[PDB]
């Protein structure tokens with residue numbers, strides 16, 4: 001059959017390595033009292049400045065920009081626009097935190113959750129197993145687009161919000177803060193090198209590949225360690241409160257995938273493309289958005305509980321959507 | 328015909344990644360002003376507490392305790408004893424930094440220099456190329472013994488010195504500081520697991536293997552990053568000064584290899600064992616001892632200027648010793 005206990009074991013064995021790093025970081029920050037808050041911030045700074053850029057480059061460079069399916073990109077952009085419209089409309093009617101002011105900061109922490117699943121680590125063992133090798137290849141384009149356009153746009157939104165804390169000058173300041181970022185350079189060099197490699201066949205030198213790998217290899221372990229450190233910093237696992245936690249998880253696991261269903265139907269995705277493009281949306285929050293929020297101090301307590309409690313519901317949620325799509 | 332420009336290229340391409348990580352760390356600490364001294368200390372603390380133990384375990388577990396050559400272990404112990412004796416005799420007459428006290432710290436640094444080469448990363452490309460695949464296994468045994476006994480003894484000496492800043496009480500305090508050290512637990516679990524794996528055939532579960540790898544993969548990149556950060560902290564690249572730099576370089580690249588030659592001759596190592604055991608000592612200083620010194624703030628200035636300017640002389644030094652041994 002499509003689903004088996006062997007698939008469940010592969011999914012669980014893919015997830016547990018992340019929770020081991022998370023728990024080690026949390027214990028080292030809280031129980032073992034190893035890293036002071038400044039040192040935890042320094043570890044997260046290293047992760048955001050040297051481990052994510054050096055892995056965004058690896059993701060983007062190892063995809064052919066010319067074979068990316070236009071339908072998938074159109075569907076993803078349509079999802080993102082629909083989610084942005086819905087979130088903006090909702091805030092006008094009721095703002096969170098007791099109906100106070102401020103659209104950005106929430107229109108950013110809602111896009112960090114709703115429209116940025118975890119695909120590289122957990123999406124593969126789940127969906128490639130459920131739907132075979134085709135799902136892996138289809139989701140590879142989604143992951144590369146995520147690292148290519150969406151993280152850069154999210155960083156621009158973060159820095160625009162930071163600047164906002166005299167209308168074109170703010171945008172210019174946001175742009176200037178963007179250019180000096182290492183993520184933008186990582187993605188630009190990644191796309192340029194993907195072009196060169198897949199057009200002129202310029203294989204990256206082994207020396208440079210090894211030098212990049214030395215720093216990028218531990219990126220995921222360090223990122224989950226940083227999430228654990230922050231968890232230790234926060235008083236409770238559900239640091240945003242139950243109500244906000246309910247709304248955050250609802251946005252992540254119902255609205256995001258439902259709007260992806262709407263987008264896939266609108267773009268007329270056929271057969272596996274329609275099915276594999278929506279089960280990807282209903283996936284854990286990820287820890288790149290968490291890294292950005294923690295560095296920018298933009299309501300990371302919402303991202304934390306989402307990451308911790310969504311890697312337990314990604315598998316059941318994908319099973320539920322797969323059963324729903326069967327008939 | 329034993330040495331070729333292709334060998335030089337492999338050695339250089341194995342060394343360059345470490346210098347890339349080092350330079351990135353140094354720039355990030357000095358020119359880019361990213362990590363404050365506290366954050367640099369936090370990154371180094373993470374490296375010492377999570378990256379080295381999780382790699383000492385990987386090194387020790389993958390060895391076969393029942394296939395270690397007794398002659399190699401005896402030769403290594405004899406070299407270490409001869410060194411310790413020579414350093415103690417020298418410290419009696421002339422003390423470093425003029426005539427002062429502090430024998431234990433200076434002998435600890437002298438041992439960290441003379442009797443702890445770099446074999447895992449640079450020894451394999453260099454001596455395996457010079458002497459073929461035969462030297463690979465012998466150097467592997469040297470590396471396993473290094474991670475098994477010598478690093479633990481070095482940590483005990485470091486903590487004894489720290490506790491000395493009422494004779495059996497100090498030793499007991501050193502032991503208590505040792506037991507809580509993550510490195511000793513990593514080495515003990517590693518040796519026990521190697522015993523289990525190579526005696527009863529137990530295989531480490533895939534889940535646990537991936538959990539360990541997530542954190543241990545970036546260990547070397549982060550270690551070189553930390554060394555670069557410390558370099559940025561120091562006023563000049565030759566932090567200890569020329570005279571002390573001359574004495575440190577001499578201790579590492581003449582006394583160490585010379586005493587290893589004496590030890591190999593005494594133990595009657597035959598043919599490749601005699602040659603491979605002495606060309607390994609004349610190798611860079613390594614960055615595990617630097618990590619320990621930086622954590623314990625015990626003259627890391629003398630280790631940084633070796634880890635740099637020794638990875639340039641490791642290749643010519645190996646060529647020189649190989650030529651000397653030919654006739």
Ligand SMILES: CCCCC/C=C/C/C=C\CCCCCCCC(=O)OC[C@H](COP(=O)([O-])OCC[N+](C)(C)C)OC(=O)CCCCCCC/C=C\C/C=C/CCCCC
Pocket residue numbers: 049050053054057180181182185186189193208212358359360361
């Ligand atoms: C054949 C070759 C193929 C390509 C090989 C590519 C390999 C590498 C791939 C991707 C890039 C990985 C980057 C990882 C390290 C990033 C470190 C970094 O830079 O951290 C951002 C840094 C900090 O900025 P801040 O404002 O936070 O702090 C400033 C504070 N205070 C105002 C007080 C000074 O940024 C600054 O300093 C601003 C200055 C620029 C920062 C970015 C420098 C690195 C990026 C591009 C330049 C060249 C790279 C390699 C060669 C490419 C091809 C020519």
Ligand SMILES: CCCCC/C=C/C/C=C\CCCCCCCC(=O)OC[C@H](COP(=O)([O-])OCC[N+](C)(C)C)OC(=O)CCCCCCC/C=C\C/C=C/CCCCC
Pocket residue numbers: 031032033034376377380381384507508509512513516520531532535539
């Ligand atoms: C089939 C299975 C095969 C085996 C699989 C195992 C793989 C693991 C391999 C190697 C170990 C890697 C350890 C890496 C993390 C180490 C972190 C750590 O521990 O950092 C040292 C920590 C801090 O000490 P501190 O004094 O610096 O600060 C205390 C300050 N203040 C007094 C204020 C509280 O130490 C303390 O807290 C002291 C307490 C002990 C610290 C060490 C804990 C980890 C080691 C062993 C325990 C169990 C391990 C796993 C199971 C093994 C098999 C049964």
Ligand SMILES: O=C(O)Cc1c[nH]c2ccccc12
Pocket residue numbers: 051052055118119120121218219220221223286287288
């Ligand atoms: O889930 C992923 O896409 C992997 C991932 C998330 N944040 C990271 C930070 C550093 C290295 C890898 C990752």
Ligand SMILES: O=C(O)Cc1c[nH]c2ccccc12
Pocket residue numbers: 378379382445446447448545546547548550613614615
């Ligand atoms: O043995 C080596 O040269 C590799 C090495 C030195 N220090 C380290 C710290 C963390 C991970 C690997 C290493």
